[PDB]
Design a protein around this nucleic acid. Structure first.
Ligand SMILES: CN[C@@H]1[C@H](O[C@H]2[C@H](O[C@H]3[C@H](O)[C@@H](O)[C@H](NC(=N)N)[C@@H](O)[C@@H]3NC(=N)N)O[C@@H](C)[C@]2(O)C=O)O[C@@H](CO)[C@H](O)[C@H]1O
Ligand SMILES: [K+]
Ligand SMILES: [K+]
Ligand SMILES: [K+]
Ligand SMILES: [K+]
Ligand SMILES: [K+]
Ligand SMILES: [K+]
Ligand SMILES: [K+]
Ligand SMILES: [K+]
Ligand SMILES: [K+]
Ligand SMILES: [Mg+2]
Ligand SMILES: [Mg+2]
Ligand SMILES: [Mg+2]
Ligand SMILES: [Mg+2]
Ligand SMILES: [Mg+2]
Ligand SMILES: [Mg+2]
Ligand SMILES: [Mg+2]
Ligand SMILES: [Mg+2]
Ligand SMILES: [Mg+2]
Ligand SMILES: [Mg+2]
Ligand SMILES: [Mg+2]
Ligand SMILES: [Mg+2]
Ligand SMILES: [Mg+2]
Ligand SMILES: [Mg+2]
Ligand SMILES: [Mg+2]
Ligand SMILES: [Mg+2]
Ligand SMILES: [Mg+2]
Ligand SMILES: [Mg+2]
Ligand SMILES: [Mg+2]
Ligand SMILES: [Mg+2]
Ligand SMILES: [Mg+2]
Ligand SMILES: [Mg+2]
Ligand SMILES: [Mg+2]
Ligand SMILES: [Mg+2]
Ligand SMILES: [Mg+2]
Ligand SMILES: [Mg+2]
Ligand SMILES: [Mg+2]
Ligand SMILES: [Mg+2]
Ligand SMILES: [Mg+2]
Lengths: 208, 316, 129, 132, 172
RNA sequence: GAUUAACCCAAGUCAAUAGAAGCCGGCGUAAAGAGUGUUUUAGAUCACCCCCUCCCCAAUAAAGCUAAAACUCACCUGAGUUGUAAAAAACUCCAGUUGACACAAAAUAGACUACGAAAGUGGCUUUAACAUAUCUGAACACACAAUAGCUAAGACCCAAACUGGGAUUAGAUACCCCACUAUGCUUAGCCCUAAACCUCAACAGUUAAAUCAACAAAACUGCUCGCCAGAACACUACGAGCCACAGCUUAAAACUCAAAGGACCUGGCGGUGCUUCAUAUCCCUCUAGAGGAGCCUGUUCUGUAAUCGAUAAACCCCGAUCAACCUCACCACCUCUUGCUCAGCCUAUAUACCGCCAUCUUCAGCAAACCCUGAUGAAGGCUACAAAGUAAGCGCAAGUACCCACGUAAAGACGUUAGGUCAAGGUGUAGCCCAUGAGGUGGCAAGAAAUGGGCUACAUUUUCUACCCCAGAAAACUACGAUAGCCCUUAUGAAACUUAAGGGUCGAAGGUGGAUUUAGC
């Protein structure tokens, strides 16, 4: 790293600084003065102080990018958001008066919830006991299950079963199926849940 | 034995003091100066002209200094003709270090009987110069533990002077951005000019005090110059943070680098020039947000035996 | 350590040398290198405590015998007086005794130093006339 | 391990010179250059012909002043002129030094068609920087 | 002396030997005061006091040391392990712990008289006590309970057959 | 071995052989206290004086007894029980509760330290009962002696050699699972062994002196008995004796070697322990890849009349920042001879070397000179409320370079691998000298196969075009995809199917890659 350990990460939160001094707690007040002395890193290009910034949609864009082509990864994400937006408007005008109250049209609320319906609770880790590897169920951490949800959605879409379908139409179709708890990505979570509950007899091999 | 440590006595150093004084009057005759008012800075300037050396090491270049700054301080003879050591702690090996611990421990006993920012404790390397004695790390810590113990107690006025000697000073540079001088153009509009740098991109930004939020990069509207939204987001960031969008007119000229290197360089220039039209408190928030710091991340060089900067050729 | 301050002061008071600190191996058996070739070692070592902090004989007891230096020592009931030339058997722990030894050795030494200046002055004065 | 222009450590009885005590990675940090011309500058030419003259001159002086050279030569070029600067021992008689100066100056001036001047600096004994 | 070069080991050993010197007492400056028979570890050295002209008839190393000490006449036999270091460390130990005739007189407060066949029955006083001479003689013992050496008893009774003893050799 | 010189003895020399010098030392581990006790003939002086742990805790033998667990049977219930790193086999009148029920074996106490000659003895009770008023005293006398084992007759819960079955394994006459027997138990006889080792004889005594090779369980004295004298052959052979008949006891030699052995030190290693770690690292975890296809390229095999070198990590687009001729050292043919050189050699040896490097090093050591310890052995050398270490010098570090203090370069000691290179050049030694030298002409350097590295791809986050980021087309047998093949032209050059570029034709495999594996904060 070209930054020294002295350099601290910057805080882009715009509503934090505005906080009145009257609300500042004694511990928080101290921190603010301390940061003045500290050196701060330059904010990276990815994150700004905009009101539309979403850390989950920026991380999902970085996990699809290939070779630093972020203009294409971001383009696919926005096309997908617009495809989810246009498909729900088409399902809202053709719905009954009482069916329109249960139709979500915000593509973000769909993206965050669909990824939450794919997060597994427990995973399988190979442990070496008696010169053999056993896939014992282990509790996945919060980050791990948030990462697996994104990786599986991108692997399913990348999978070469759909012969000639553009990513925005594929990613949009999988996000709407996981929103209703359907599709292979959800099924892939169940298959990992069915193998962790069948091999619960080997839940003592692990130590941590 | 052929290798002997170069020992310099007082008589040898006394003859070196006379050659420098005479050489100091000769060097002033060469340059045509007055010998009396010929300081050491002029000697360093005259020796760098008469003996020009481009050696990167400044300790390997010609130097004509006073013998007290060249020759190191040496432990003087520690006994008379009879052979009795002057000091009573000679046989300890560290008579200077132990005489100081004996004095500090003696002042801590008197206290019982009758009963800060900008300063740092003398470093180990600086404490071996006051005593002319080699000191281990552990011995230095022991000495610091007694001084701190001295401070906690209700030390008298004299003791404060004693401790102060071992407390060196550190000049801390206030982490405050340098405001640019507001200028005025022919029409009378106020503005501030600053410069930025990102990778290989260099940018100059002029920020007018009053404007309608119009930005011209190299004479072209920013949206035309920057098609990618991300680049435009970087331009907005400084102004959005200080909640003053659509209030200034910017005229910048960026050269070098690429698409994303040019925006970063402009962001930093605008941000620095926008600190003159905001309060001191807002400038500190910009600093804590990473808007006034120059990103030092630049491309790393490739090494002769590797595929890349850090990537290695495949191990067979 | 309890009497380290007291001994160092008395040594200064009586114009003599002290070493109440950690004995670096070689002070005596290696003085030429550590101090120099023309160094003069002690002619008499007075041990007020013949043991170290791990209840074992001080290394200087044996190092002074190798350099044929006469030693004086205050040996207690758990001390070794075999290499000590003049051993005084007494308590070496109580502070009321160590103050006596220091007061006695400091007085006997100061007297002799003042006794020679009287014998020399008489000899020098008598010699002149 | 790297070997170039390095004097390996010894018991301490080996005396080395300043130039001999520094390795190649100090050539521009603690050392200068023994030859100074323009051949190797950007846009200059005849770098291969100034080099051959240096290799021969150092050998001509080593065999013409045998046992008398305390340190390496410092070759200097200013236009047509070539200046050889040398540190030599005082063992040899001065009469023989003046002979070798007029013989080497003249011979090398007719061989390289240039004015050659040689500047000797006698020293009692080989200056020692440290003992490796 | 220990070093990597053999010439460096000679200096260390040579210069350190003058700081670990012994003083060996000599009877009439040519021999030991009495028969010494010690054992260092596993090495046995049995020295014997001999008259002038006998020479050194001992282990070759003992002959080197004795010349250094100044002992012209002495007989020694080495048994057990012939380790040079135990023979050297054991010889100096026995040669420094030998009691002189003056000490013997002071210890017992009596006269030490030397009897020689060449001088017949004449009694020669070699040492006398500085302190009070004892008026009572040492109680005579009919038989002394002293441990003997079979090698010496076997020689005096003419039984020690050896084709290597008392062989003609060079002057030592 | 020859030659020269020298050394020793000398009318002798000195090869083979034989002989001459052999007991007062030892026995914890080197060869020796032979399993135990008693006595005899005798010896000793520790026997009178003169004195201090009787009895009781797990001695022994006999008879009797039984608390816990188990087996078995019966009832009731259930449908399985066993086995384990994980399985199979086995069993299914099986399993669980309850109750009844031993010729087996004896938790806790026992953190005790006792009895007995030793072996050995640890549940309860009772009887008998535990030699000796000096010591010593036996391979064989006399009497005992764990386990195993024999013979005979009983018993039988469990365990269990053998055996059988199941599994593992390259194999498995083994380790793991199951079942079962001899045997372990009782009675009566035999056998007579042990790492029967507290490897440290019995009795009496001492703690001073030289404490004492080492280690272990401090070192000695008196007295006596027993044993032992290089290793191995040899717990053998023969002989004798024995209820022993594949046995035990006692116990040699020949051949053979010049060592074996005991106890330490250092270092290395360990499918060695603890603890703490690894940040691109050991493993998992993140990302792009490799191995799959084609091409390029190197190597190995094969081939050819037709180089050399590197070649586990640390070789393999390595020497070469480079081979059409030249380079060139190779092959075939021809030619020259003081030869471009006061010659020459790309001849052998890198295991003679300099020189330049690799590697551990993505280390932190290295070391002169002293000192001390260990009884002056190889060896070793710290404790900060400090206990023998001090240290110039080399390195690291620091400085420097590049965009700073960061990071990256560079640097990186001593050593290791007789690591690499005599073909950079030089060079020691041995070798060739009408040829192992020099020159000319022509020529080969391929590909059944295998392998390493790389390039391009298998497409839709793509293809083509315009633009350089608000587009329009394409899109599976005229798609994606060759830098290959074939043909032509051009460029360089004296010389090009041959090298490179371009165009045209052609439109293959391939559809995401097994085992494994690389790099990166
Ligand atoms: C000091 N010498 C050591 C000794 O060497 C010996 C070694 O002797 C060997 C005999 O010839 C052989 O018949 C004998 N072979 C038998 N079957 N007996 C070896 O056992 C014997 N080695 C030995 N005892 N260590 O080989 C011989 C040629 C030797 O060099 C004679 O001096 O033994 C060697 C190891 O065997 C060591 O390497 C040597 O250092
Ligand atoms: K045992
Ligand atoms: K070891
Ligand atoms: K691949
Ligand atoms: K491939
Ligand atoms: K080499
Ligand atoms: K050679
Ligand atoms: K060469
Ligand atoms: K490849
Ligand atoms: K393409
Ligand atoms: Mg790259
Ligand atoms: Mg005391
Ligand atoms: Mg034995
Ligand atoms: Mg026994
Ligand atoms: Mg036996
Ligand atoms: Mg029981
Ligand atoms: Mg008996
Ligand atoms: Mg017998
Ligand atoms: Mg027997
Ligand atoms: Mg038996
Ligand atoms: Mg039986
Ligand atoms: Mg059974
Ligand atoms: Mg089987
Ligand atoms: Mg049975
Ligand atoms: Mg036993
Ligand atoms: Mg006996
Ligand atoms: Mg034998
Ligand atoms: Mg047997
Ligand atoms: Mg037999
Ligand atoms: Mg027989
Ligand atoms: Mg090859
Ligand atoms: Mg040719
Ligand atoms: Mg050739
Ligand atoms: Mg090599
Ligand atoms: Mg740096
Ligand atoms: Mg490097
Ligand atoms: Mg450095
Ligand atoms: Mg096509
Ligand atoms: Mg083509």
């Amino acid at each position: 790293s070209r930054y020294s350990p002295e350099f601290k990460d910057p805080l882009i939160d715009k509503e934090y600084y505005r906080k009145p001094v009257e609300e500042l707690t004694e511990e928080e007040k101290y921190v603010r003065e301390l940061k003045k002395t500290q050196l701060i890193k330059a904010a990276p290009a990815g994150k700004t102080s905009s009101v539309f910034e979403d850390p989950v949609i920026s991380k999902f864009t970085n996990m699809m990018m290939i070779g630093g082509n972020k203009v294409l990864a971001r383009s696919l994400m926005i096309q997908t958001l617009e495809a989810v937006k246009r498909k729900q408007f088409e399902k809202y005008h053709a719905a009954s008066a009482e069916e329109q109250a249960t139709i979500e049209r915000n593509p973000y609320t769909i993206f965050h919830q669909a990824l939450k319906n794919c997060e597994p609770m427990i995973g399988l880790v190979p442990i070496l006991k008696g010169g053999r590897f056993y896939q014992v169920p282990v509790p996945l951490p919060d980050r791990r299950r948030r990462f697996l949800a994104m990786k599986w959605m991108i692997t399913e879409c990348r999978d070469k079963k759909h012969q000639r379908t553009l990513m925005p139409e594929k990613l949009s179709h999988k996000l709407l199926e996981a929103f209703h708890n359907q599709g292979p990505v959800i099924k892939r979570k169940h298959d990992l849940h069915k193998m962790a509950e069948a091999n619960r007899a080997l839940a003592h091999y692990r130590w941590w | 034995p052929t290798s002997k440590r170069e020992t310099y006595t007082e008589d040898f150093i006394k003859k070196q003091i006379e050659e420098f004084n005479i050489g100091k009057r000769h060097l002033a005759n060469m340059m045509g100066e007055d010998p009396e008012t010929f300081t050491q800075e002029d000697i360093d300037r005259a020796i760098a002209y008469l003996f020009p050396s481009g050696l990167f090491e400044k300790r390997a270049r010609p130097v004509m200094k006073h013998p007290e700054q060249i020759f190191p301080r040496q432990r003087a003879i520690q006994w008379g003709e009879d052979g009795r050591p002057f000091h009573y702690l000679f046989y300890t090996g560290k008579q200077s270090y132990y005489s100081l611990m004996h004095d500090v421990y003696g002042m801590l006993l008197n206290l019982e009987k009758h009963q800060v920012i900008g300063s740092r404790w003398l470093i180990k390397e600086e404490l071996e110069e006051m005593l002319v004695e080699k000191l281990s790390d552990l011995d230095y810590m022991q000495f610091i533990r007694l001084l701190e113990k001295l401070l906690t107690s209700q030390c008298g006025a004299a003791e404060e002077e004693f401790v102060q000697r071992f407390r060196r000073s550190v000049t801390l540079e206030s982490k405050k951005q340098l405001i640019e001088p507001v200028q005025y153009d022919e029409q009378g509009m106020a503005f501030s000019k600053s410069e930025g740098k990102r990778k290989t991109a260099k940018a100059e930004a002029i920020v007018y005090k009053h404007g309608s939020g119009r930005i011209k990069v190299n004479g072209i509207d920013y949206q035309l110059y920057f098609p990618i939204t991300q680049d435009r987001e970087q331009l907005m960031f400084p102004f959005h943070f200080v909640d003053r969008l659509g209030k200034h007119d910017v005229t910048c000229t960026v050269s070098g680098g690429g698409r994303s290197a040019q925006a970063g360089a402009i962001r930093l220039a605008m941000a620095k020039a926008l600190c003159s039209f905001v309060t001191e408190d807002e400038v500190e928030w910009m600093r804590q947000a990473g808007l006034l710091t120059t990103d030092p991340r630049v491309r790393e060089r490739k090494k002769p035996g590797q595929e890349g900067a850090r990537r290695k050729f495949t191990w067979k | 350590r309890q009497f380290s301050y007291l001994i160092e002061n008395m040594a200064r008071d009586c114009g003599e040398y002290a070493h109440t600190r950690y004995f670096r191996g070689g002070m005596l058996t290696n003085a030429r290198l550590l101090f120099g070739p023309t160094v003069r070692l002690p002619d008499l070592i007075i041990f007020l405590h013949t043991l170290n902090n791990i209840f074992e004989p001080h290394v200087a007891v044996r190092d002074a015998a190798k350099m044929n230096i006469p030693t004086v020592g205050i040996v207690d009931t758990n001390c070794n007086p075999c290499l000590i030339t003049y051993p005084v058997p007494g308590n070496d722990d109580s502070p009321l005794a160590v103050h006596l030894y220091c007061r006695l050795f400091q007085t006997a030494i100061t007297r002799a130093k003042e006794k020679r200046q009287q014998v020399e002055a008489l000899y020098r004065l008598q010699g002149q006339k | 391990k790297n070997r170039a222009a390095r004097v390996r450590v010894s018991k301490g009885d080996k005396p080395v010179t300043y130039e001999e005590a520094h390795a190649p990675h100090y050539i521009a940090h603690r050392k200068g250059w023994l030859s100074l011309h323009t051949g190797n500058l950007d846009g200059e030419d005849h770098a291969a012909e100034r080099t051959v003259e240096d290799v021969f001159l150092r050998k001509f002086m080593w065999g013409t002043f045998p046992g008398c050279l305390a340190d390496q030569l410092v070759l200097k070029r200013r236009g047509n002129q070539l200046e050889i600067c040398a540190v030599v021992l005082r063992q040899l008689s001065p009469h023989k030094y003046y002979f070798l100066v007029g013989y080497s100056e003249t011979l090398l001036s007719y061989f390289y068609k240039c004015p050659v001047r040689l500047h000797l600096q006698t020293v009692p004994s080989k200056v020692v920087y440290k003992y490796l | 002396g220990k070093a990597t070069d053999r010439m460096d080991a000679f200096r260390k050993a040579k210069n350190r030997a003058v700081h670990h010197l012994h003083y060996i007492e000599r009877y009439e400056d040519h021999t030991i005061f009495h028969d010494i028979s010690l054992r260092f570890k596993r090495t046995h050295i049995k020295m014997k006091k001999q008259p002038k002209g006998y020479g050194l008839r001992c282990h070759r190393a003992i002959i080197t040391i004795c010349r250094l000490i100044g002992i012209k006449d002495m007989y020694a036999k080495v048994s057990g392990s012939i380790n040079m270091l135990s023979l050297t460390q054991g010889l100096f130990r026995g040669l420094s712990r030998q009691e002189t005739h003056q000490q013997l007189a002071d210890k017992k407060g009596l006269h030490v008289v030397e009897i020689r066949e060449e001088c017949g029955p004449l009694p020669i006083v070699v040492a006398s006590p500085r302190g009070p001479l004892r008026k009572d003689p040492e109680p005579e013992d009919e038989v002394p309970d002293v441990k003997l050496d079979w090698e010496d008893v076997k020689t005096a009774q003419g039984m020690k057959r050896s084709v290597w003893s008392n062989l003609k050799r060079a002057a030592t």
